[PDB]
Write an enzyme that holds these catalytic residues in place. Structure first.
Site, PDB file in Angstrom:
ATOM      1  N   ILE A 147       0.796  -1.214   0.000  1.00 25.30           N
ATOM      2  CA  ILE A 147       0.000   0.000   0.000  1.00 25.30           C
ATOM      3  C   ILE A 147       0.846   1.291   0.000  1.00 25.30           C
ATOM      4  O   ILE A 147       0.321   2.362  -0.335  1.00 25.30           O
ATOM      5  CB  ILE A 147      -1.024  -0.033   1.167  1.00 25.30           C
ATOM      6  CG1 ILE A 147      -0.344  -0.214   2.556  1.00 25.30           C
ATOM      7  CG2 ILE A 147      -2.082  -1.101   0.901  1.00 25.30           C
ATOM      8  CD1 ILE A 147      -1.245  -0.013   3.771  1.00 25.30           C
ATOM      9  N   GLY A 148       2.122   1.191   0.376  1.00 22.53           N
ATOM     10  CA  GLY A 148       2.989   2.356   0.434  1.00 22.53           C
ATOM     11  C   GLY A 148       4.454   2.083   0.185  1.00 22.53           C
ATOM     12  O   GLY A 148       4.947   0.964   0.370  1.00 22.53           O
ATOM     13  N   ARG A 149       5.156   3.130  -0.236  1.00 19.93           N
ATOM     14  CA  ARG A 149       6.580   3.116  -0.501  1.00 19.93           C
ATOM     15  C   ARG A 149       7.176   4.365   0.129  1.00 19.93           C
ATOM     16  O   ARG A 149       6.687   5.478  -0.099  1.00 19.93           O
ATOM     17  CB  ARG A 149       6.826   3.130  -1.998  1.00 19.93           C
ATOM     18  CG  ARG A 149       6.630   1.801  -2.706  1.00 19.93           C
ATOM     19  CD  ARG A 149       6.642   1.953  -4.224  1.00 19.93           C
ATOM     20  NE  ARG A 149       7.692   2.882  -4.665  1.00 19.93           N
ATOM     21  CZ  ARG A 149       7.501   3.965  -5.416  1.00 19.93           C
ATOM     22  NH1 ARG A 149       6.290   4.269  -5.863  1.00 19.93           N
ATOM     23  NH2 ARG A 149       8.523   4.750  -5.724  1.00 19.93           N
ATOM     24  N   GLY A 150       8.191   4.157   0.950  1.00 20.40           N
ATOM     25  CA  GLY A 150       8.900   5.220   1.632  1.00 20.40           C
ATOM     26  C   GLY A 150      10.339   5.265   1.174  1.00 20.40           C
ATOM     27  O   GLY A 150      10.756   4.468   0.320  1.00 20.40           O
ATOM     28  N   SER A 176      11.498   2.409   3.656  1.00 23.95           N
ATOM     29  CA  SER A 176      10.463   1.458   4.062  1.00 23.95           C
ATOM     30  C   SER A 176       9.494   1.099   2.948  1.00 23.95           C
ATOM     31  O   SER A 176       9.445   1.768   1.920  1.00 23.95           O
ATOM     32  CB  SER A 176       9.688   1.972   5.275  1.00 23.95           C
ATOM     33  OG  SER A 176       8.682   2.895   4.898  1.00 23.95           O
ATOM     34  N   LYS A 224       4.860  -1.999   8.184  1.00 29.26           N
ATOM     35  CA  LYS A 224       5.916  -1.147   7.628  1.00 29.26           C
ATOM     36  C   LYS A 224       7.248  -1.831   7.761  1.00 29.26           C
ATOM     37  O   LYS A 224       7.838  -1.794   8.838  1.00 29.26           O
ATOM     38  CB  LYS A 224       5.919   0.234   8.318  1.00 29.26           C
ATOM     39  CG  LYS A 224       6.980   1.247   7.852  1.00 29.26           C
ATOM     40  CD  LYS A 224       6.740   2.584   8.549  1.00 29.26           C
ATOM     41  CE  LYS A 224       7.942   3.486   8.526  1.00 29.26           C
ATOM     42  NZ  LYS A 224       7.641   4.822   9.100  1.00 29.26           N
ATOM     43  N   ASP A 265       7.110  17.068   9.920  1.00 32.17           N
ATOM     44  CA  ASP A 265       6.849  16.652   8.541  1.00 32.17           C
ATOM     45  C   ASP A 265       5.353  16.626   8.251  1.00 32.17           C
ATOM     46  O   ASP A 265       4.829  15.644   7.725  1.00 32.17           O
ATOM     47  CB  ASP A 265       7.511  15.279   8.240  1.00 32.17           C
ATOM     48  CG  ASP A 265       7.681  14.944   6.760  1.00 32.17           C
ATOM     49  OD1 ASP A 265       7.503  15.874   5.898  1.00 32.17           O
ATOM     50  OD2 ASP A 265       7.994  13.763   6.451  1.00 32.17           O
TER      51      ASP A 265
HETATM   52  N1  LIG Z   1      -1.352   2.839   9.020  1.00 32.28           N
HETATM   53  C1  LIG Z   1      -1.359   3.092   7.710  1.00 32.28           C
HETATM   54  N2  LIG Z   1      -2.531   2.983   7.040  1.00 32.28           N
HETATM   55  C2  LIG Z   1      -2.537   3.178   5.715  1.00 32.28           C
HETATM   56  N3  LIG Z   1      -1.515   3.478   4.906  1.00 32.28           N
HETATM   57  C3  LIG Z   1      -0.369   3.595   5.599  1.00 32.28           C
HETATM   58  C4  LIG Z   1      -0.207   3.429   6.967  1.00 32.28           C
HETATM   59  N4  LIG Z   1       1.112   3.644   7.333  1.00 32.28           N
HETATM   60  C5  LIG Z   1       1.709   3.925   6.198  1.00 32.28           C
HETATM   61  N5  LIG Z   1       0.874   3.916   5.110  1.00 32.28           N
HETATM   62  C6  LIG Z   1       1.200   4.211   3.714  1.00 32.28           C
HETATM   63  O1  LIG Z   1       2.581   3.996   3.483  1.00 32.28           O
HETATM   64  C7  LIG Z   1       3.208   5.211   3.017  1.00 32.28           C
HETATM   65  C8  LIG Z   1       4.594   5.322   3.603  1.00 32.28           C
HETATM   66  O2  LIG Z   1       4.520   5.121   5.031  1.00 32.28           O
HETATM   67  P1  LIG Z   1       5.195   6.086   6.116  1.00 32.28           P
HETATM   68  O3  LIG Z   1       4.908   7.517   5.858  1.00 32.28           O
HETATM   69  O4  LIG Z   1       4.770   5.688   7.570  1.00 32.28           O
HETATM   70  O5  LIG Z   1       6.732   5.747   5.864  1.00 32.28           O
HETATM   71  P2  LIG Z   1       8.081   6.591   5.852  1.00 32.28           P
HETATM   72  O6  LIG Z   1       8.249   7.302   7.142  1.00 32.28           O
HETATM   73  O7  LIG Z   1       8.069   7.585   4.676  1.00 32.28           O
HETATM   74  O8  LIG Z   1       9.269   5.552   5.648  1.00 32.28           O
HETATM   75  P3  LIG Z   1      10.812   5.663   6.034  1.00 32.28           P
HETATM   76  O9  LIG Z   1      10.849   6.485   7.377  1.00 32.28           O
HETATM   77  O10 LIG Z   1      11.457   4.331   6.211  1.00 32.28           O
HETATM   78  O11 LIG Z   1      11.467   6.471   4.869  1.00 32.28           O
HETATM   79  C9  LIG Z   1       2.244   6.325   3.406  1.00 32.28           C
HETATM   80  O12 LIG Z   1       2.411   7.492   2.604  1.00 32.28           O
HETATM   81  C10 LIG Z   1       0.880   5.640   3.274  1.00 32.28           C
HETATM   82  O13 LIG Z   1       0.353   5.613   1.953  1.00 32.28           O
END
Ligand SMILES: Nc1ncnc2c1ncn2[C@@H]1O[C@H](COP(=O)(O)OP(=O)(O)OP(=O)(O)O)[C@@H](O)[C@H]1O
Ligand SMILES: [Cl-]
Length: 321
Positions: A38-41, A44, A61, A149
């Site tokens: 569902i997501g790409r970080g 993560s 995650k 952020d």
């Molecule tokens: N609890 C959740 N419910 C739904 N979608 C989620 C949830 N947590 C994360 N996501 C999805 O995953 C995406 C990336 O997650 P998140 O923002 O928590 O990671 P990140 O902090 O950017 O990663 P990293 O710190 O490792 O670079 C979000 O933009 C969202 O679409």
């Protein structure tokens, strides 16, 4: 000196803020059924999952090799904010026995991309959701934490169930008076002037600038609101709206001298009135109450910005529940 919550961590035990001395108990990942990504970080990958033991959906995650310093902080902050209004719940922390890869298990929020969702919102919808983000921000500030952020990308909304969560606590840090913080945080578009002019002694006020940028973008239907080509240009995009007179006054107060790069690109701009951002497509939501609220948030002087506590008291929200 932040109006509110300055000395929160001063009266808190060292265990509360010393995240690098945190002993993490990693659990077996077996119970969490991994499904669609569902997501790409940056470091993560987030997947839709299911806690087969607790009959509960979750967002798993998975973490790319990042120093425990970064993970321990995110865990400590999420732990300290458990049960906060509209703050994502951390349900578990798991580590694969073989690969030794850590994953954080969060409560699942069925989000719809803000680029698709936000245009479907009514005046009453933005009103409610902004109030909720303010409640979340007032809670973490009261717990001596800055999110650092705030952006539409870090706000999960399940419109069908009027459920909203402030996510991405990876850049979140604890506020301690006199501590110098890394200015290289937040999206360029949501970076407050303090981050652009290299003022490392920033506070909770940073989150109100970012939320201001979000609210301006939502009601004026222009996201990102301030769209700079670089970090130096971002201050120009800001100054072309707020005027340079209040900027020079801001630099003179905090005794900040701008780089050899800034003086050439930064012209002398008059403050653009908020009415100049009105269009046919946005007048219906861009009413006088919300414009006043934006005006109280998007202020160079971090010390003169409205607090989430105060913003909630604003007439824009007539929240009799
Ligand atoms: N609890 C959740 N419910 C739904 N979608 C989620 C949830 N947590 C994360 N996501 C999805 O995953 C995406 C990336 O997650 P998140 O923002 O928590 O990671 P990140 O902090 O950017 O990663 P990293 O710190 O490792 O670079 C979000 O933009 C969202 O679409
Ligand atoms: Cl940049």
């Amino acid at each position: 000196i932040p109006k509110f919550y300055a000395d929160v961590n001063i009266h808190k035990p060292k265990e509360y803020y010393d995240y690098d001395n945190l002993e993490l108990q990693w659990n077996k990942p077996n119970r969490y059924e991994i499904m669609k990504k569902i997501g790409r970080g940056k470091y993560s990958e987030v997947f839709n999952g299911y806690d087969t033991e607790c009959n509960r959906p979750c967002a798993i995650k998975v973490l790319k090799p990042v120093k425990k310093k970064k993970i321990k902080r995110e865990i400590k902050i999420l732990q300290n904010l458990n049960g906060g209004p509209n703050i994502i719940k951390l349900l578990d922390i798991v580590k694969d026995p073989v690969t030794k890869t850590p994953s954080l298990i969060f409560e699942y929020i069925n989000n719809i991309d803000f680029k698709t969702l936000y245009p479907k919102f009514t005046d009453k919808d933005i009103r409610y959701y902004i109030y909720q983000i303010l409640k979340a921000l007032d809670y973490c500030h009261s717990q001596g934490i800055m999110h650092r952020d705030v952006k539409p990308h870090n706000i999960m909304i399940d419109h069908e169930n009027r459920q909203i969560r402030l996510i991405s606590w990876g850049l979140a840090e604890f506020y301690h008076p006199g501590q110098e913080y890394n200015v290289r945080v937040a999206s360029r578009y949501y970076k407050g002037p303090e981050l652009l002019i290299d003022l490392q002694l920033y506070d909770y006020s940073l989150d109100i600038w970012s939320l201001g940028c979000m609210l301006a973008g939502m009601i004026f239907k222009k996201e990102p609101f301030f769209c700079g080509h670089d970090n130096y240009d971002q201050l120009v995009k800001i100054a072309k709206v707020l005027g340079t007179e209040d900027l020079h006054a801001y630099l003179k107060k905090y005794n900040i001298k701008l780089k050899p790069h800034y003086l050439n690109i930064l012209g002398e701009y008059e403050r653009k009135p908020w009415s100049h951002f009105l269009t046919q497509s946005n007048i219906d939501i861009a009413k006088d109450e919300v414009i006043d609220l934006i005006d109280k948030m998007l202020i160079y002087d971090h010390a003169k910005r409205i607090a989430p506590k105060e913003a909630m008291e604003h007439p824009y929200f007539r929240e009799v529940r």
